[PDB]
Symmetry: D2
Subunit: 337 residues, 4 copies
């Protein structure tokens, strides 16, 4: 019957996932809430009419035996702590990115989970659940294009706020590409390099934008990723995989077409929140269903969180040094193989 | 909440709706089933692990006061009888097409609903809930192309069985177009004409396929619909609306692209079930949510069912006469505004 | 050496053809011109720096023994006379549409050419030389889609002058479709029907625009053609051929794409003269080349002119009567086989 | 009257140019040819039925006072020689790439031309005359997308023979991109870097294919160019320019579309000779018209040839070293401004 879920962190995306579980998905219910702000957390149970005790902290909510699983949706740097705790409490955990702000912290989560002996942790890299990326994965697995040789991608955003900084280009933005690409081609990153084109007029003086990130896999796949967060025209994810015998490419989001005033056109999304809305529903549903059927989670793993953490670090180092940097990856544990 | 739902008819679409409510959607559960094969209904309850009572018939299912609403997913020609009974028992009813196999059948349902004083009946014309059609209607209502003048559409299917007959081209197939178009442009159908191109080699000698159906609305919009149920290449829905100042067009379903062996290509679906899957989820969720929030349904009405019935009747007439036929619609009751 | 060409009618089209012959194409030169405004004629000679006599009329131009061939680019109604005179003078003739203003006019020209005993007359239906239509013809002749069953096309124009009349929709505009389609599918027209949507706000009150013209071939191919000469958005030619086993479609004219301000777009041409510029070059070059290589022309024939006339007449009839009208088509002389 | 053209080298490209001049274009004729293969040369004169003299060498041909201009279409390394001889004879010269096999060779040509005092040398970089590239240039010069920041391009080929070497990837292939991009964005190259992904199974082991070349301009435009000469699927040129406020992209070559067997598709050329046939006609016609109207040529210059040589040299340097290499360009002479 219903999977009982506690929510750690009721900001925007905590409110979204709650709405999801309460009003859209099957098999689960929100029974507990927290942080930080005792208020607001109470305002959230109000807003959504929840049968939910407002606990004052992780351990508190995590103490409850009427909670089977948790969503960690709080401030990024807070994640590692709550995840560790929930693992010790042996509850299933869905953790929004990042798993932890350091590779060391991801490694600690990895260590703990391996002790429990089964997969409790799923990281919220929703792109793997998007129908376009699923199709790309299927085509590759069915050897449609032969071996992958190169990947060209772009992650574009119309404009960012004052506080968006150069490192966020890789840490908050490219991390999605970083997680999804190694999954697609099943190969590990080896080296990264960052090249800066002239700065766009739309970027604030403190921010280096756009940038080009070149990544090589151990297999020798070269990825060039454009990141351009002040592109003005829209929010835009583009991904092209070049293989030996052919090329596959991610599709545009669905739009009606329009002939009008001398132009034939389709819409480009302006809002990042509309790009992957279905994927978010799918990943949470899969969280719920995996548990109810397999006694463990199925999505991106604690190791995937670690791979991202390490890769983003090398990228930031590449941003600073302007040189080709190594990606320091431990061999993958048997437990995640 | 938990809307408590009884299913009348546990065939293919019945089982798929049961799956949706049980494993995909929010706010409802299946508590009762009935079918003409009572053991078949039992297997379904087994298969989906339902906490549901198997009833011998719809009368007794409708007698169960723990049943809030029903789905009528039985044999087409039997829908009308089940709907009438559900209206008298005052349950909400989601009826798969058709509502009734005759205009008179629909009119009977219409006046029974008007007696009850609120909306009980929602007809399963799922295209209205498809994002493409929603986008088309949004554009229209925002005056993007001015007044609609012409609609060019096509409904294509790879192949049909031995028992698909000429009348089914309009009754089972074009009926989807007939419902969605008058809704899109807010106009009533006035007349229809059927034109037969040479028979396709892919069609059995008793079937006339393809067909062209020309429809004129009262306001003077002209619709040209191509029906070709043996097109071989795929399942394909196309729709273009030509307005005074511009043209809008329904998108292709999402697909990765492929460059390979001298061709740049995307997928065309082979399977009608894959085309509108999301729409079915949305329509049923809307049935549930409208009831739980407004105490009445919100989708295609019994009146839309009537409109479809009158129009397909005129189309069948036109198939046999080769002449322009009037669509004789009674004025729309104030109840259905 | 050069094919020596005289030009009858030195208005807009006459000047453009003179331009391509003088400055773009191989193997010909203008040696004579005539008009009606004997100032503009002398003017064109100087503007294009031509070593050419200006004559006062066709008779005197056709008298000139060093003229090998003529282009008839005069006022529409005057074409027939000049073509006839040229045939009697035994000169080759490229005649801009229309060959004549009546089917009888076209038939007369057909008879004189048969008397001359070889092909002198090429009619300027340039679409057959457009690379997109050439590709459609080639796909059809390679049996890529099976037998053609239906054709859907549109001929759209941003706006017309107040002189444009309802009959001109089929006589001046659809006549291009009428020619190209029977050529593409190698079939004769049998019947036509015209349906009027409500009048567009962009159309003057005396003009019925847009129009839908339904044409059936003897073999049972059904053509649905949309004509909309005040569509505002652009000049647009669309053509989709539905065959038994698949569908082929004319491409958009080439254009860079643009992502900007929330839209992904390509250009739609605003003026008809840019649409087929290459085809005009190819058709004239073919006129020159065929004459020099074979001693007769090879393009659209006087008989093709006749077919267009008879089909347009039947369309004008359908315009007035609102009924299905027969295309009164005489049998094709072996001379044109 | 006619520009009298001599052709040096009657290989494949030489033959094509003779064909367009003799049978397609305006205002010139072939009056002289020479080739290392005498029989081939005389056979070309028969084949195209030329009114031309076969000369045993370029000295003879260039000494012919009835020769106004020459096309140099001989073996690559022999180009420099013929170009210098032609400038000395003060003949107009269309030189197929490369201008010379070294930057030194090009510099000597630059030197001799400046002495003459006018432009005699046009280099055969035809992409500049392609309608797609012209539209890109027009959009950029109208500042449709603001300042260019990044360019992503690809040059792909189905297969190469056993002669093709790693250096030819930049020397014979990328050289087209190298010329067209600095022309598009009006900026000079600064540094280049080469990255090798894993080798394609379609490549002979003596060849490194594919390659990624990264070029920075002095203004800070970053260019990422994929070269892949055994991509199997087709010949394919892609080019996307990312600007501050928008993105413009080269179109696919014109193709009809096809729906068939579960795919919606367009053709991809397999044959490089088909991608740019129109550009070749336009470039040669430009050569002829510029001479006849301005007394000097006006396409890509000897200086453009020199840029290509230096930039290609540095790319080959980067190929061997694996490091970011400098493009050492001298100051552009006033003669070429
Ligand atoms: N998977 C995806 O596609 C996706 C998409 C978006 C976000 N995320 C991730 O989800 C996590 C949380 O995101 P969010 O947008 O929901 O966060 P949020 O609402 O900004 O943060 C959650 C709560 O913490 C408070 N807070 C945290 N740090 C604060 C500070 N320094 N000052 C003031 N209040 C602070 C917030 O208050 P304030 O109102 O003042 O912030 C809010 O009450 C992040 O790790 C983010 O990267 C993932
Ligand atoms: N909205 C849509 O797009 C959509 C899509 C599909 C279907 N539908 C509609 O939903 C309804 C049911 O569809 P379905 O595909 O589930 O149908 P189905 O499985 O073929 O038929 C449903 C039930 O009717 C019975 N039945 C079928 N033919 C019969 C006949 N000739 N005589 C007596 N009983 C008969 C079946 O018996 P058995 O138990 O022996 O099979 C089954 O119990 C139909 O009216 C159909 O038009 C709508
Ligand atoms: N193949 C195609 O796609 C295509 C495209 C465009 C046109 N065409 C055809 O080519 C022909 C010429 O077209 P256009 O646009 O060049 O036409 P135009 O210039 O208007 O007509 C040619 C000349 O006719 C003169 N004229 C007009 N009315 C006259 C009258 N009643 N009596 C005597 N002379 C008269 C005008 O004299 P002034 O010089 O004093 O004005 C004009 O120069 C047309 O029949 C048209 O259908 C074909
Ligand atoms: N703009 C463009 O896109 C483009 C396209 C293609 C080529 N090109 C350029 O045009 C030039 C010639 O190209 P192509 O493909 O036409 O060459 P080709 O036909 O192989 O050679 C052209 C001429 O050089 C001779 N030749 C060829 N190989 C030779 C060798 N190994 N030693 C001595 N003489 C030799 C040929 O005579 P034999 O037959 O007796 O060898 C012929 O007269 C090259 O510089 C090439 O890069 C440019």
């Amino acid at each position: 019957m219903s999977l009982r879920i506690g929510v750690i962190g009721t900001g925007k995306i905590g409110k979204e996932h709650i709405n999801r579980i309460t009003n859209k998905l099957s098999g689960a219910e929100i029974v507990a809430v927290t942080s930080v702000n005792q208020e607001a957390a109470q305002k959230v149970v109000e807003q959504y009419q929840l049968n939910a005790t407002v606990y004052p902290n992780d351990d508190s909510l995590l103490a409850d035996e009427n909670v089977d699983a948790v969503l960690v949706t709080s401030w990024g740097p807070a994640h590692e702590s709550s995840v560790l705790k929930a693992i010790k409490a042996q509850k299933y955990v869905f953790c929004e990115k990042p798993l932890a702000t350091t590779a060391e912290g991801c490694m600690r989560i990895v260590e703990e989970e391996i002790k429990v002996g089964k997969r409790l942790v799923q990281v919220g890299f929703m792109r793997r659940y998007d129908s376009g990326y699923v199709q790309l994965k299927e085509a590759l697995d069915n050897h449609v294009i032969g071996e992958p040789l190169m990947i060209h991608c772009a992650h574009r955003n119309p404009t960012v706020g004052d506080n968006y900084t150069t490192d966020m280009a890789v840490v908050d933005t490219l991390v999605h590409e970083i997680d999804v690409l190694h999954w697609l081609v099943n190969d590990d990153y080896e080296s990264v390099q960052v090249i800066y084109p002239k700065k766009s007029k739309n970027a604030l003086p403190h921010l280096k934008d756009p940038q080009i990130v070149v990544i090589e896999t151990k297999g020798g796949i070269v990825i060039n990723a454009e990141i351009y967060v002040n592109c003005k025209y829209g929010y835009d994810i583009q991904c092209e995989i070049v293989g030996e015998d052919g090329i596959i490419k991610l599709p545009e989001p669905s739009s009606i077409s329009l002939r009008k005033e001398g132009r034939f056109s389709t819409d480009i999304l302006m809002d990042w929140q509309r790009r992957f809305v279905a994927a978010y529903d799918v990943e949470i549903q899969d969280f719920i269903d995996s548990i109810q059927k397999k006694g463990e989670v199925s999505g991106p793993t604690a190791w995937d969180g670690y791979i991202a953490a390490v890769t983003t670090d090398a990228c930031v180092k590449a941003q600073e040094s302007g040189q080709k940097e190594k990606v320091e990856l431990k061999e993958k544990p048997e437990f995640y193989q």
